[PDB]
Every structure is written in C-alpha cells, then in structure tokens.
Amino acid sequence: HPDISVDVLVIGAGPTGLGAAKRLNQIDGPSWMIVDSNETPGGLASTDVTPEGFLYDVGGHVIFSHYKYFDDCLDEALPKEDDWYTHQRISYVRCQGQWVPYPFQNNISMLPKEEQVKCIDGMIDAALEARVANTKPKTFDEWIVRMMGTGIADLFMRPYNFKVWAVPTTKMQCAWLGERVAAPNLKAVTTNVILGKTAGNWGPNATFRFPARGGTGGIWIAVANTLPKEKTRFGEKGKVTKVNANNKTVTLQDGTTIGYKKLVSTMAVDFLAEAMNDQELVGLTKQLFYSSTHVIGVGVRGSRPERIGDKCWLAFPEDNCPFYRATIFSNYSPYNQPEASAALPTMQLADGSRPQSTEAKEGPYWSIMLEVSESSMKPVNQETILADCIQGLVNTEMLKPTDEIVSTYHRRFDHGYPTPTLEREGTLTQILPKLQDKDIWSRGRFGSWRYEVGNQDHSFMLGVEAVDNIVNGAVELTLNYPDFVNGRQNTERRLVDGAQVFAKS
Template sequence: MSNEIDVDVLVIGAGPTGLGAAKRLNQINGPSWMIVDSNETPGGLASTDITPEGFLYDVGGHVIFSHYKYFDDCIDEALPNADDWYTHQRISYVRFKGIWVPYPFQNNISILPKEDQVQCMDGMIDAALEARVANSKPANFNEWILRNCGKGVADCFMTPYNYKVWAVPTTKMQCQWLGERVAAPNLKMITQNVILGKAAGNWGPNATFRFPANGGTGNIWISLAKTLPQKKTRFGEHGAVEKVDASAKKVHLKDGTTVKYQKLISTMAVDSLVEKLGDKSLVDLSKGLFYSSTHVIGVGVRGERPERIGDKCWLYFPEDNCPFYRATIFSNYSPNNQPQASAKLATMQLADGSKPSSSAAKEGPYWSIMLEVSESSMKPVDQKNLLRDCIQGLVNTEMLKPGDEIVSTYHRRFDHGYPTPSLEREGVLKELLPKLQDLDIYSRGRFGSWRYEVGNQDHSFMLGVEAADNIVNGAAELTLNYPDFVNGRVNSERRLVDGAQFFQSRKGIRTDDKPLKP
C-alpha cells in the first residue's frame, strides 16, 4: 500500500530556488510544507563535484555577488564564520590574437593592435551617429550589438563569443534580457583611453565576489539545507518525482509515495514539468523554448601556479583555436579547491598529449582550470574527443605549456545548461507560466521560469522566496516580473528591502488573489 502525505505547499527541487522557497516557508512558520529532490545532495546546478584525485569543480562558473540583503543573510547563516569565505577582486580578460584584453572587451580596445583599434573605433563612431537618428528598438541581440558596439567590436569579439556561449546565432536572440550583463561602451571614455594608451577599470556587479573556503559553491547549499527541518526534506531515491497530477493536486514519487498539496512550487525545467503533467497542449507550447547544453571540463596540473596565470579569475575566448568559451582558474578561488602539495599523484599525460617519462606518483603543488563548452542542435560538439580538444585549446591559448603535467581530468555534461533568451521566449512564457499558475503550480528557477537575466544564484534563491511569499500572503514576485528593478536599473542601491512596498504602490501588479491561509 502506497504512503500518502498531505502538505499545504510542496517544493520540487533542492537547488537555490527550491531551498529559497523552503527557507522562507519555514521562516513564516504557517503552512505545512515539504521539499523533494531526486539527488542525495542539495544544490542542483550550483553543486560541486570532487575528482578521485581531490580536485573540486563547480558545475559551471559560479561566484557569490548579491542584489538582496535577505539572500546575504541566509547564506551567512549557513556559513557564518569569517574563515568560511574568501573575497576576491575579479581579474578577467579576453584572449584575442595572442594578447590578454581586460574585460569588458568593448571598453578596452586601447589594448588591441592598432589596425583593430581603428576597425573598432570606426564601428563605434558609425554606431553612435546612427543611434542619434534611430526611431526603433533593436529587433534582436545582433542589432543591439551593432547599434551599441559597432561592426568592429561585433566582428572581433561580440558575435563570435556569444555564439560560443549560447550555441545559437545572435540574430535568433532577443535583447530585453541584457540589463547589467553586457556593458554598453562609453565612446568618449574609450577614445580617451585609446589616445592615452590606458585600460578601463573593473565593470559590472561581480567586480567583487565571495567564494566558500571549503567545499566549493555546493557547500553553500548543503549548509543551507541543514538549517531546514530534516523531517520536511526527502532527497535521493525517496524524493524523485514520477508524475504530477494537477487535477488531483498530487505528486507521485518513484518510491510509491503520493504527496497531496494545495500549491506546488516546481523548480525542475518547465519543459520537463509539463511532460510529467502529461498535458499535450502545454508540452507543445514548451517546445517554443530553446536551451543549450553545457560541458564542464576540469584539468588538474602539477606545479607552482605559473606567472602567466597569476591571480586571474575567469577568462573569455572568442576565437576558434579552442572549443571553450570561458576558463576559470578554479584553484585561485580557494587553496582547498585542489589537493594539498603533499599529496602524491601520478602524471596522467603531458599537455601535448604525450606520455610522461615516469608513472610514479609525486608530490605537488597543484593548480586547476575549469572550462565550459556549449552545445546545441545549431552547434554540435565532438563529445568523444572534447577533453582532448580542450587540453589542446589550453596549449593553443598558452594557458598550458606542452610539457605541463596533467594529474587529473574531469568532464560532465549538463543537458540543460543555459535557458536561451530566444526571440520566441517571451511569447511562450507569457502564456505558459500563467497557465501553470492557474493550476496552482509556480514554475520558478533558472529553467523553471526560463529567464536567464534572473538566473544567478541570488536571483534563483529569491525566485523561490518570493513564490513562497506570494502563496502565503499575495506579495509581488519582483524578481520574476521586474528583472530590471532587481538588477539595479531602477533601484540604484540594488538592495531590496522594501521593494515590495514600492511596487505595490504601482499599477499592474499581478499577485495571487487567493493567497494560502496559514
């Protein structure tokens, strides 16, 4: 006989969004709730893997920077000690024609060879002149690039790089998602820097960031999950979802348990959710959403961190001499992201692919690189040889020397890597998400709500928090509905404390008119 559980709110998924919802529901201490996840370890797409040799790799490039005090408070409760964290100033570059151009590329063309400076400046001047007479908004991301950066920057960096990231042409992407993620160039400042031969300073919300001292990014979410009542969590085989019955408001778990709910917060990918609902019309609608897959490659190296690597954090690669679009010097984030120098490891291969002269295990020290490669139907990947090709790309870009000793490798593919801001996205979401909410299903999170512009860890966490608040008391979901506001275009402080009250005073707020009564 199957077991049946009855709760007011069921949360599916223990990534940042699901844990945010659970944290808030527990804090409110009103409705009954439960959180389930098919993985034994919480964290979702913000978890961390450890290789047999002892190298840590996040499942993608994650750092902590925040737009929300509530988020800060919650993760500081999870990791409360000063020595739980390292704080870094971002040091990022773009690799272009064998030189390191400070990030963002479009603000630092003063570093480029003279002929490329001329090409980029010509394009920027033309774009600035055309912008004065433009009477329409850019129709897609490609037009946004040309209008803001000009053809030179587009050809040198923006177009090839974004194709490597998104695995779709920029002509097939909309541009409403951009917000604070792409720097619009300041032509006067760039001109001054070209003449004076100066580089621009740091830009962006993650110019300063935090990283856990131990356990990688995943340790944040493991620790936060421990602050929840364990009797309300079901992880692993007992938390795997088999089917969602929206009409009966029941979720059937694979172990035979049935969970009855009043409201459901689902953080699984929305295209997967509608499959489990078995609603053909919603499945067909979800097919208008596009995503790319992500390959995360890790390379552990023996030796002192070379001077050419220095204190670099993450690096961008627009050119075709390597398959990866981004490299993170993961060993620079924490000395505990790799084995201690006293650990004895055998050399697997040299960077040029040749065998080492000796197979005997030797001591370190060690350092590591984490790479990301995108894949889609429009950008296929040679999975069988991808690790080999990435190591060769590291040699091509002088990240590794041919004789460097590789002692550990890592490769993991994530089917849902990036939710693509395609031209069709908004049309689908404006129909799909409300239809689900009419069924008392809140689809939230990086792939639950499919909005990359609010897909960072802090955003994702708050999508869950705000869904819980909406369910319990009808509060506005600012992160879902007002990305520009939470990302700082309206709120210059970018610290949301009384944001809900601010927006409640404005017209057009969509809230649940039947909040759950505790």
C-alpha cells in the same frame, strides 16, 4: 487519500527550491515539504570532485547578490570568517595573442593599431547612428552592433556569444539585457586608446566571496542543513515521477503520493510538463530553447604560473579553442584542489605526451575549469571534447606543451542555459499562466527559464518570492520584473522580518 499532505510542496532543492523552503521555514505558518531526486542539494550550483581531489563547480560560478535576504541565508549557513575567501572580479578576453582586460572595448589598445583604427571607425559609426536613433534594437545582434560598432562586435561579443549560447546572436531577443540604451561610450574607448591605457572593471570594491570548502555546492549543503530534516526528502526517495495537476497530487519514484494545495516546482518546465502528462504543455515547453553545458576540468602540476596570475575567469571569442569560458578555479579557494604534499602521478602532458615518469609526485597544484556549450545548432563530440579542450588550453597559452596534467573531469549537463531566443517570452506567456491557473508556481533557471534572473541569488529569491506570493500576497518581482530587482539593492525582505520579531514577544 494520499500518504502525505501539505499546504505547499516544493519540488527541487536547488537554489530556487531551497529559497522557497527557507522562506517557508521562516514564516512557519502553512505546512510544507521539499523533495529532490538527488541526495545532495545544490542542483546546478552543486560541486563535483575528481578521484584525484580536484573540485569542479558546474562551470564558473561567481556570486553577485542583489538581495540582503540571500546574504542573510548565506551568512547563516556559512557564518565563520574563513568559510569564505574574497577576490576581485578579475576577468579577461583572449584575443589575438593577448589577454584583454574586461571590458573589451576599453582595452583594445592592446590590439594592433590597424585594428584599433577599424574598431574606432566602427564605433564612431555607431555613435552617430545612436545620436539619431528612435527604435529599440530587436535582436541581441542589433544591440551588440549598436552598442559596440561592427569592428568591436565582430572581435568579441558576436563570435563569443555564439560560443556561449550555441545560437547565433541574430536569433536572440535583447530585452533580457535591461534598459541601458544601445549606444557606445565613444569617449571612454578613444581615451584609453589615445592614452595606450588598460583598465579592468574590478578594484578593491568590485569583489566576490567564494566558499572556502566544498565549492559552490558547500553553500547549498549548508543552507539545506538549516532546514528541519523531516520536512525534506532527498535521494531516489525524493524523485518526482508524476504530477496530477487536476487532483493536486504528486507521485514519487517509490510510489509515495503527496497531496498539496500549492505547488512550487523548480525542476525544468519541459520536464514538469512531462510529469503532468499534459500534452498541450509538452508541446509548449518543447518550443523553448536551451543549450547543454559540458564542464571540463584540468588539474595541473605546479605553482600558479606568472602568466595566469590573479586571473579569475576568461572569455574566448576565437575558435582555436572549443570552450567559451575558463575559470582559474584554483584561485577561488586553496581547498578546490589537493594540498601541495598530495602525491599524484602525471596523467599526460598538455600536448598529449605520456609523462617521462609515472611515479606520483607532489604539488603544488593549480586548476582550470572550462565550459563548452551544445545545442542542435552546435554539436559537441563527447568522445573528443576533453582532448579538444586540452589542445585549446595550449592554443590559448594557458598551458605550455610541457605542463603536467594530473586530473581530468568532464560532465555533460542536459539543461545548462535557458536561451533568450526571440520566441522565448511568446512561449513562456503561454506556459506560466496555465500552470498558475492550476496553482503551480513553476520557478527557477529552468523553472521559469529566464537567464537575466538565472543566477544563484535570483533563483533563491524566485523561490522566496513564490512563497511570499502564495502566503503574503507579495509581488513576484524577480520573476516578472528583472530590470527592477537587478537595478537596486533589495533590502526590505530579511531572514528576520517584523513578523518573527513581534511573535517572539
């Protein structure tokens, strides 16, 4: 006899868990409950704030929704027109003193001519190989070089992805990138070079909306608030410490035990295996690879410098900086940093100098959010990484030596990226089925470990589709067919389906 019993138990109130709970709440048939060890929902889509009042997401978080369901829930949670700000998807690659518009290969006219000649020769080779190709690429590296050619590969995607994944490109699968043939568009690349043209992959219709307040985490707080309070349990009181798969019982930190018939676990699957004391599953989940994510934030005094402008996020293939991505987070919402009348002392100059004065002076302020990856193949000195990042900002000309830093943030997230290693699927197809057999739907960015469906919308839907499978016999498409859900706008499943309509009648 456990203290609580429900039909379906959801561990975790990240996007994936909140999805489950939303669908469960919409269906309102089987009983359910959601728990989380954090008092605040959001998981890796949470947001911190520095004591100086600079918000930081867990690194660059831009929403692109493949599902009208996701949209419905965001619209419900933040329904007002100024709950959101709309921006173009403006991104660039830092290469050889230049801000190269994404996509890199369409903009190498900004590079020295001698370099363009190397790139184009490289891609000519790739086009001619691609014309007679009858195998699929087996690694991320093959995919890159087949798609880009050697010169362009070496300039960007190759060193960039090591910096991103903290594993070399030769060690990753490439199926996760979808069905597009690994072949170059040689005409597009040569055309822009010939025309001396630059062109980004954004415009009036390639946008994203970002929450006005609270950062990305404001979304998930608001979504969570729509759920019936009593069916939630967040904080130390919601910490799962034991899962008895055989007895279908979960134990919490405070000794409270929960009976379930179906388990949706959105905690990391290596953690769940531990919570199960399933030795075999601990072995299997230890074979999975992941990188850790250091997020570093810098609050800078002054209005937005011309050189920064409308830039949103930025990729960094070169090694004069430790970060792989920078976000101009102050561009996402004016409320991601203090108002210009907020007085802050300067903490340091970007070159590391003490400020001439320690007096609190006003803004306006802008803000840079950096990401650094860590793994057993790429260590990160936690003591010096902030300074390395700030030096990185100077080296990349994001900051002048004189720019005034007024806030710093550094947090290290254990599970950051789940890595599409060559061995991933071989391992996941041993883990997920055994959990399934015990009526455990383990889902999410580290629930099911599949990056290609690891964004907020994917996660959210992984939870929804897990619930729909449990209840309505629906296919878990996001889980098992990433190319399908990413290749279409999923419009059928809505926050109001015909069931709720016919029922109110």
